[PDB]
């Protein structure tokens, strides 16, 4: 059984180079599988990027000249391993990236077509974000007041961020939303609940705000 | 390189409904060189079908795929709770390889408009410097809405962002959250702010507002 297995999500600056890598388990020999990488950007669709294919490696009009494709056998300690190496990174290259693998083994197969192909397995892709900030942790302020009342958790970098109320005791009515990208390049999100208007001078709500990058932890109580 | 144009962008489906997506190719591909992916929120896409109507192994079969001229189609039969997502087709008849630009597949639901709400800026956050006002729509059906804020009846224009939730697995609904930001400066010259939200439950498109220091 085939898993694909990426390195890890990468924060990197403008200009600098990045490699990520794929160890393919359940796959014997890149002599006998084809490597497709693709990416996906923020809410986009999908792009090939390039490939490796018979020990042969090449890239897509877009990319060449800026990307190297490799691969290598491996046994015992590590399953065979591709890896793909990207230099002068900017923004637009912001996205996941995911590795791919397609058997090449029999010819009258249908899943390729002299070098170009459709993807059989995938990896959970590694996200490269590609920013200038530097490590921040949250400000968190109060949304106070059926009821609505929340969290506004402001200003960090980078993802994630976590939000549970009242150490966990309420969840049916949290909405916690997807963290936006502000102009000034740093992360903003909020969480909301909403409650009978009739428990809010009975009730407490607290909001607890995890930001594991920069070991932040608030705990915030939200008041009428 | 092929261009694939997929239709629609999104639709809205019940379980157990049968659904069709399409994908046209701006040339003809006389080999049926394409394929279809399944992709869930949050997770890597999975091949379906491949050749154009070749199941992968282990994929349900209430999948299929066809082809009449330029158009190709996936057809999902008996629609199933795990199918809901974004579905993409790909050629791959030529090089390089192309997807769609890809078609979302959500619940469909009775109307419901949203319980709309607004904030003002925590007296905390002012305190910092800086002055957010947030909107919150909550559990709303469809999901298609418009929020506009405004400053001393001023149309606000850049300076707002928006945030949605993915559909709720228990209500199929939507909540969404607009904020606006200003300066501590701007927000301490004006008088009223207002969100105002149109939505097809709404006969009427609503306003929620305060006067600051109210
Ligand atoms: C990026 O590569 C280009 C050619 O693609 C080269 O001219 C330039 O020096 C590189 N930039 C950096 C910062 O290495």
């Known amino acids: 059984q085939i898993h694909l297995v990426q390195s890890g999500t990468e924060v990197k600056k403008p200009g600098s180079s990045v490699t990520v890598s794929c160890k393919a388990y359940?796959?014997?020999?890149?002599?006998?599988?084809?490597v497709n990488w693709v990416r996906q950007a923020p809410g986009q669709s999908l792009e090939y990027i390039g490939q490796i294919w018979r020990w042969k490696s090449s890239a897509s009009h877009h990319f060449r000249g800026r990307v190297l494709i490799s691969a290598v056998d491996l046994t015992g300690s590590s399953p065979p391993i591709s890896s793909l190496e990207i230099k002068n990174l900017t923004s637009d290259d912001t996205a996941v990236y995911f590795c791919?693998?397609?058997?090449?083994?029999?010819?009258?197969?249908?899943?390729?077509?002299?070098?170009?192909?459709?993807?059989?397995?995938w990896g959970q892709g590694t996200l490269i974000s590609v920013s200038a900030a530097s490590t921040k942790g949250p400000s968190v302020f109060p949304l106070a007041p059926t009821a609505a009342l929340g969290c506004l958790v402001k200003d960090y970098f980078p993802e994630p961020v976590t939000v549970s109320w009242n150490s966990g005791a309420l969840t049916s009515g949290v909405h916690t939303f997807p963290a936006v990208l502000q102009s000034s390049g740093l992360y903003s999100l909020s969480s909301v609940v909403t409650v009978p208007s009739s428990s809010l001078g009975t009730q407490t709500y607290i909001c607890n705000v995890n930001h594991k990058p920069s070991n932040t932890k608030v705990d915030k109580r939200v008041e009428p | 390189d092929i261009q694939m144009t997929q239709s629609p962008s999104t639709l809205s489906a019940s379980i157990g409904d049968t659904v069709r997506i399409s994908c046209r190719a701006s040339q003809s591909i006389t080999g049926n060189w394409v394929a279809w992916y399944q992709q869930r929120p949050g997770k890597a896409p999975r091949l379906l079908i491949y050749?154009?109507?070749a199941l992968l192994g282990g994929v349900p079969s209430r999948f299929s795929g066809s082809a009449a001229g330029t158009d190709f189609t996936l057809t999902i039969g008996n629609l199933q709770a795990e199918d809901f997502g974004t579905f993409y087709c790909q050629q791959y008849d030529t090089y390089p390889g192309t997807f769609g630009q890809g078609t979302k597949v959500e619940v469909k639901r009775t109307v419901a408009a949203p319980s709309v709400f607004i904030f003002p800026p925590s007296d905390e956050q002012l305190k910092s410097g800086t002055a957010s006002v947030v909107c919150l729509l909550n559990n709303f059906y469809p999901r298609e809405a418009k929020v506009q804020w405004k400053v001393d009846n001023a149309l606000q224009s850049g300076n707002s962002q928006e945030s949605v939730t993915e559909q709720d697995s228990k209500d199929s609904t939507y909540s969404l959250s607009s904020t606006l930001t200003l300066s501590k400066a701007d927000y301490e010259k004006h008088k009223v702010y207002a969100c105002e939200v149109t939505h097809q439950g709404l006969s009427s498109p609503v306003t929620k507002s305060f006067n600051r220091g109210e």
């Open positions: 050749r154009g109507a």
């Open positions: 791919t693998t397609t058997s090449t083994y029999d010819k009258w197969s249908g899943l390729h077509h002299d070098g170009v192909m459709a993807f059989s397995s």
């Open positions: 359940g796959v014997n020999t890149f002599g006998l599988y084809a």
